[PDB]
Amino acid sequence: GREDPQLLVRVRGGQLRGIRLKAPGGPVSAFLGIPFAEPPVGSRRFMPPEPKRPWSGVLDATTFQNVCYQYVDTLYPGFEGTEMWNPNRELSEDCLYLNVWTPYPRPASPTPVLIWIYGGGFYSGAASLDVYDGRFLAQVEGAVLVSMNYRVGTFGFLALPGSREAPGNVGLLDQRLALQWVQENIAAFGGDPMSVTLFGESAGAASVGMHILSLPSRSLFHRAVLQSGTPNGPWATVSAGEARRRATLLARLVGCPPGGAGGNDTELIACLRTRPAQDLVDHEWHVLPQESIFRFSFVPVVDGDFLSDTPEALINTGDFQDLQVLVGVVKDEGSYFLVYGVPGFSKDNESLISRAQFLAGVRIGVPQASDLAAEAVVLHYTDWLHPEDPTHLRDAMSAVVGDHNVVCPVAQLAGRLAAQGARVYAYIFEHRASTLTWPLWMGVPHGYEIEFIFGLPLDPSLNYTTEERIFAQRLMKYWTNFARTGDPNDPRDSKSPQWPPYTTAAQQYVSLNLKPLEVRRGLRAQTCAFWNRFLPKLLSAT
Amino acid sequence: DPQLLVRVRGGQLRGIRLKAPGGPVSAFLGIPFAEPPVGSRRFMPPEPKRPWSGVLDATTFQNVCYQYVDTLYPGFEGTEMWNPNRELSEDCLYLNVWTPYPRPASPTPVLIWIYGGGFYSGAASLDVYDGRFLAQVEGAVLVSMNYRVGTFGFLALPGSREAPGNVGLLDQRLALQWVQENIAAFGGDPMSVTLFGESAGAASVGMHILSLPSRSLFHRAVLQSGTPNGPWATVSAGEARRRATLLARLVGCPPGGAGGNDTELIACLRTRPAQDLVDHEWHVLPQESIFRFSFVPVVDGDFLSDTPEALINTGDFQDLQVLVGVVKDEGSYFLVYGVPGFSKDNESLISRAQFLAGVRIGVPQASDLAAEAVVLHYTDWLHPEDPTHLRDAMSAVVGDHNVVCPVAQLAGRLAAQGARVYAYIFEHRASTLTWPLWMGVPHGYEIEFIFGLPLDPSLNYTTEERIFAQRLMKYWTNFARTGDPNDPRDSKSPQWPPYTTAAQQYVSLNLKPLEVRRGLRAQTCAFWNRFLPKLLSAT
């Protein structure tokens, strides 16, 4: 005896025992740190994941595993806003492990599965973080939730395209591997391989999109949720040549020609593979082209392999009838990245800024924009009746960053997926958390709908308001509804009023906030026509 | 009759007594201000009228300057009203003076009118320019002159003795020096002179403002739906020469293409029938266009020392009072002149592709990219195909480009240079309007009201319309005397605030009482004035 049959599971690779957690409502079963891949260390660094070699004995799934090696953000030390995101377990090169939450006892019927891919800009993050805790969706919505670690940073994305040694997108491959893993083993946990919804946020949402666009990933999941990020758009992909440039430059920086050499690839990677992980982490930021924000050093490369063409091309020409996606943004996307190096912007004060500061800002936030590309931006975003207004200027600059990296690319992906015949639902998330740390001017900043999606307000010890608790429940029901049926709507019910599909014609999306749903038509339409349609033609012939 | 006979350093004049609703008026019509620029004097700066003996007949309107007669909508009051109401002749230079009956108490302020019509047409002889209501009602001495138009006024071979260019403007200026010498005898004040004009006329007003010798001939100025700056009001010396050369080439000149001296080319041009010049006049335009007329003022380095842009940018405006403004829908009137899909008959709902090409037409100097910019700007992207919007938006494109944004730019530039400026937007559509309603308050229809035409009972205006008319005449004349549109005492109005670069206050002229808005355009005018030029270069 002594073995709870609910916590014992035999998956393809061996036996693991999980742990019983107390969620507020009931208990839940958590299986944590299940290795989905042989550790990519030593000679396996920069390389696609080999799948986990099988193990005898019973593996211990009772606890979270190491976080993939990453930059730990030092901006505002000891500050909840920045540090919620920072690694909560020990950094290792051996990070590829996944987590599964299910109801207790393990579900009778094959419940649909939600796979969560985290964000953090492909330089950072981990499934261990408190906001991604699957316990509440498991308990309340009776769902089965998976989250995998993927290599971030140089280890995940450093690429010397066309080489066997550092092929690129190995992080995205980690993700896909874990997707396969869900296919092979999830039913053992009470999951339903026939229904799999990928959902992610920021870089993570971009990852989701990338799996939509890559054929080998399409066979593993049936539905997608992109929250505040897209595969198209300025920040999420790089030219193969750019990636190569950045790689050989970082190589130079860590003293790995060695000595002024560096023509032979295999030789260069093989040298890079000797330097201690933390040195690579210390240097990954120096390779960037410009003084910029919302631009990351090592990201998915367009290799003609994982991404066969650019996501632009791909979403333009694809066939999406198989597919239903739920996509949306939060109310102020820009404000977070502002304190990250547009001058004038702090969390510690109201951040009113001069005009010169606004202009300078526009150069920083739209870094690849020439003059007149940028003068176009300024013309569009200035209030010309009151061009010097510091409040307006501030709010403007926020909106510029937000619109350029998030809202207009989300709008473009929605429009195209719809036109390509997919069921698309769209949302703007407008509720500011009562628990929120960052100052008032930053609004409902990037990433702060997450904790409401995972139903953290359902935890009483966390100091949310009862209205937020109800709200959080309502979101959970939307998401697990989409997961289950491909529609966010409450199926039996007709009310509040129901949430309509985003279409190319009507373009309806809804507002997610404390009030019930209202339907808004067109999503930053004129502005996105500028960003998506006009501005490309501009800096393109500048 | 005592008043009907007046002296005028050129010699004796006999006026005529006329009936305004509220009094009599002494009307003197067809006073020659220059010896007729016919024959060898065609294309040449006007020489002043040589004096005469005898009592000259001022009792009727003289000839209209030789011009294209609009054939578009036969017998339609709307287009017809701008056509010549007198006979066409190259001997057209005669002005018109209105005094009340009797002659003055003290010297009264003077209002000089310069007509619109695109430099390709016009006359003071026109109906809506009826000068008497302002005279009788507001006690104003009101002058209106004919200046040369079309090739005769503006054809230039810049640098040439015999076709210097801007001679139509010189006709205006000379009319002004005649008013500076001779208006006194009509009981007008030579030290109060307020030039007001509409459209091309407005452009001429600003044109005098910018021209140095013109400066001493006036005091205040009203610009109605036109500016000296902008897309349509001037050409380069280069393009002037280009067009003159081509038009010559379309009629005989120079004979069989011997090339060479401009003197012989102009000499040859002088011997063609006036109607021939008019016939081939419309062929010399570079592209297909809506605004954009063939022969206009030219920046010669003489009448304008630099381009109007440069002059309103560096100009010192210290003592200047200007009343500028636009009507509600400017562009509408023009669209039926050859943007496809626009008639006065059908209500002109258009396709998207129609709009797309219409943009190419009304902003002809735009490259593909500048066009893409204009479309992106004026398209409602939530409903890109909606015909009603596409139509109204095309009217807005043509209007904003050719009039509104120019007007705003001049306003702000004049304010920044220390001029007192009053801006107005005219919201009221006359009931007597023969044009379809989709054209709103079309270009040039605020003239009926400024000239006090609703005070004429037999014209069928509404009553609030004539109280409106009286309002407007009070406005304009108050500006004439003061250099300020308001009442000296009465408050009311509510006060019409000076347009400044900061506040940007402009007023609404409506039947309902005075309203103050801020930011005439701005967004949309920063496009046109700041950005689009940067984009017209590099593309």
Ligand SMILES: *[C@@H]1O[C@H](CO)[C@@H](O)[C@H](O)[C@H]1NC(C)=O
């Ligand atoms: C690349 O050059 C190295 C020597 O630096 C050599 O050992 C290796 O075999 C070469 N491989 C290729 C790609 O030719």
Ligand SMILES: *[C@@H]1O[C@H](CO)[C@@H](O)[C@H](O)[C@H]1NC(C)=O
């Ligand atoms: C041009 O030709 C005519 C011939 O009548 C002459 O009077 C004139 O002076 C000539 N010379 C030039 C180049 O002006």
Ligand SMILES: *[C@@H]1O[C@H](CO)[C@@H](O)[C@H](O)[C@H]1NC(C)=O
């Ligand atoms: C509206 O009328 C005009 C003139 O008759 C014509 O150019 C236009 O095509 C008409 N609109 C349509 C498409 O019915």
Ligand SMILES: *P(=O)(O)Oc1ccccc1C
């Ligand atoms: P994106 O990948 O930019 O999302 C981020 C980035 C940094 C910190 C938190 C989050 C959600």
Ligand SMILES: *P(=O)(O)Oc1ccccc1C
């Ligand atoms: P502008 O000179 O364009 O003014 C016009 C033009 C044609 C007809 C009437 C008017 C007032």
